[PDB]
Design a protein around this ligand. Structure first.
Ligand SMILES: CCN(CC)CCN(Cc1ccc(-c2ccc(C(F)(F)F)cc2)cc1)C(=O)Cn1c(SCc2ccc(F)cc2)nc(=O)c2c1CCC2
Length: 371
C-alpha cells in the first residue's frame, strides 16, 4: 500500500514461475509490462512460512512470525496479478538476486518501477539456504496438490563462514544463469508447465525478450551475486550491485569481469574492507561506476523500508534520514540511466546520466569511505 507505484509509462503485471518443480529447478517472481491496468492486487508476502522465516532470520522466536504475519500478511504490492503481458514489443530483461534472509518478493519497489519502464524482471528465489524460507516440490504430484516442501535459512558457525558463503554465491550465480536460461528458452518456444497453477499463461512470453539486453542486479548478498554472475556468464551484458556485500567472493572474480558494473551504495552500511574489494574491480580497460546515497541505510533497497512509519522505521533500522521514496527513486533512476548506456536502450533514461555521476543533493560520487 505504501510501496511506490512505477514512475514509468507502462502498467505493471506480476506473477510467479517455477520450473522445474524440484529444489534444483528455477523459482522466480516475474514483473512485466501489462497490457491492461485493472487493479493493483499482487500480494506482497504470499505465504505464512515466510513470516516464519523472517522471524527465525531476524532473531525473533515464534510469536513474531505471527505478529509480522498479522501486521503484513494482507499487504499488497502495486502490480496487476497475472495481468496479460503487453504485446507487440521485445523487452530488455533483468535477473534480480535477493539478499541474505530475503526471498523473491521483497524487492518489488525496484522490480515494479523497472517494469513500468519496459523491463521484464525475474526476481529469483535462491535455494542455497540464504533465503529466510523458500519452497519446492518433491514430485510432480506434490506440485499438483500444492504440497509444498519448505527450506529455511541456514545459520553458520565462524569456521564455516568462508567456505559456505562462497559455495553459496556460486550456487546463486548458477541460479541467476539458470533463470536466464528458463526465460530465454520460453522466449524461443520451449513448452513449459509452471509448477504453480496461475491464470498467467506462460506462452505469452514467446518472442517477447530482447536477447541482447540482459542485466543482473542484486542487493547485498545479491550484489556479490551480480559480480559472480557476470564472471561466469557473458549473456549478462552489464550488472548493477546495490550495496554489494563482497565477502563471499574468491579473489579470482575480480580479473574475470568484462561487462560494465555499477555500484549503488548506501551511506550507512559500507565499511572500508568491503569497499576495497569493490575498488579491486576497477581497471582502466573497464567501466565501473559508484554512487553513494546520502542518509541511506542498507534496508533502503528492500521493501520493508516502505512498510512502517517514520519513527518505528528508524527504530528498526529499516529507514534512514533520507526519505525512503526519495532514495529508491534515485537508485531506480540511476539504474535506468546505466541500463540505457550499456544495453543501448533507445529511451529517455540518459536524462538521469548525471545520477550515474553523483550529481545530486542526495548523492555522493564514489564513496564516503575515503579509502
Ligand atoms: C546476523 C543476522 N542478522 C541479525 C542481526 C542481521 C540482519 N541484517 C540487517 C537487517 C536489519 C533489519 C531487518 C528487518 C527486516 C524486516 C523487519 C520487520 F519485519 F520487522 F519489519 C525488521 C527488520 C532485517 C535485516 C542483515 O543481515 C543485513 N544483510 C542483508 S538484509 C536484506 C533483507 C533481509 C530480510 C528482509 F526482510 C529485508 C531485507 N542482506 C545481506 O545479504 C547481507 C546482510 C549483511 C551481510 C550480507
Amino acid at each position: 500500500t505504501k510501496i511506490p507505484r512505477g514512475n514509468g509509462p507502462y502498467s505493471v503485471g506480476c506473477t510467479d514461475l517455477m520450473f522445474d518443480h524440484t529444489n534444483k529447478g528455477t523459482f522466480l517472481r516475474l514483473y512485466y509490462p501489462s497490457q491492461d491496468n485493472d487493479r493493483l492486487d499482487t500480494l506482497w508476502i504470499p505465504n505464512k512460512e515466510y513470516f516464519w522465516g523472517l522471524s527465525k532470520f531476524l532473531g525473533t522466536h515464534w510469536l513474531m512470525g505471527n505478529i509480522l504475519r498479522l501486521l503484513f500478511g494482507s499487504m499488497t504490492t502495486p502490480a496487476n496479478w497475472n495481468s496479460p503481458l503487453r504485446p507487440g514489443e521485445k523487452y530488455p530483461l533483468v535477473v534480480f538476486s535477493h539478499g541474505l534472509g530475503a526471498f523473491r518478493t521483497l524487492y518489488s519497489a525496484i522490480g515494479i518501477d523497472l517494469a513500468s519502464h519496459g523491463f521484464i524482471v525475474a526476481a529469483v528465489e535462491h535455494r542455497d539456504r540464504s533465503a529466510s524460507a523458500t519452497y519446492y516440490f518433491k514430485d510432480q504430484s506434490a506440485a499438483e496438490i500444492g504440497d509444498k516442501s519448505w527450506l529455511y535459512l541456514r545459520t553458520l558457525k565462524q569456521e564455516e563462514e568462508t567456505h559456505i558463503r562462497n559455495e553459496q554465491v556460486r550456487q546463486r550465480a548458477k541460479e541467476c544463469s539458470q533463470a536466464l536460461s528458463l526465460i530465454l528458452d520460453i522466449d524461443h518456444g520451449k513448452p513449459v508447465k509452471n509448477a504453480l497453477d496461475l491464470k498467467f499463461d506462460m506462452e505469452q512470453l514467446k518472442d517477447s525478450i530482447d536477447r541482447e539486453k540482459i542485466a543482473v542486479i542484486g542487493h547485498s548478498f545479491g550484489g556479490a551475486t551480480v559480480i559472480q554472475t557476470l564472471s561466469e556468464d557473458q549473456r549478462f551484458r552489464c550488472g548493477i550491485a546495490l550495496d554489494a556485500w563482497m565477502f563471499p567472493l574468491g579473489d579470482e572474480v575480480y580479473s574475470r569481469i568484462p561487462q560494465p558494473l555499477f555500484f549503488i551504495n548506501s551511506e550507512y552500511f559500507q565499511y572500508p574492507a568491503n569497499i576495497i574489494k569493490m575498488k579491486k574491480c576497477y581497471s582502466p580497460d573497464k567501466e565501473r561506476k559508484m554512487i553513494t546515497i546520502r542518509g541511506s541505510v542498507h534496508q533502503n533497497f528492500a521493501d520493508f523500508t516502505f512498510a512502517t512509519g517514520k519513527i518505528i522505521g528508524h527504530m528498526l533500522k529499516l529507514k534512514g534520514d533520507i526519505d525512503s521514496n526519495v532514495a529508491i527513486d534515485l537508485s531506480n533512476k540511476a539504474s535506468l540511466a546505466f541500463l540505457q548506456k550499456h544495453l543501448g536502450l533507445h529511451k529517455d533514461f540518459d536524462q538521469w546520466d548525471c545520477l550515474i555521476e553523483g550529481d545530486d543533493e542526495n548523492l555522493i560520487p564514489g564513496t564516503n569511505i575515503n579509502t
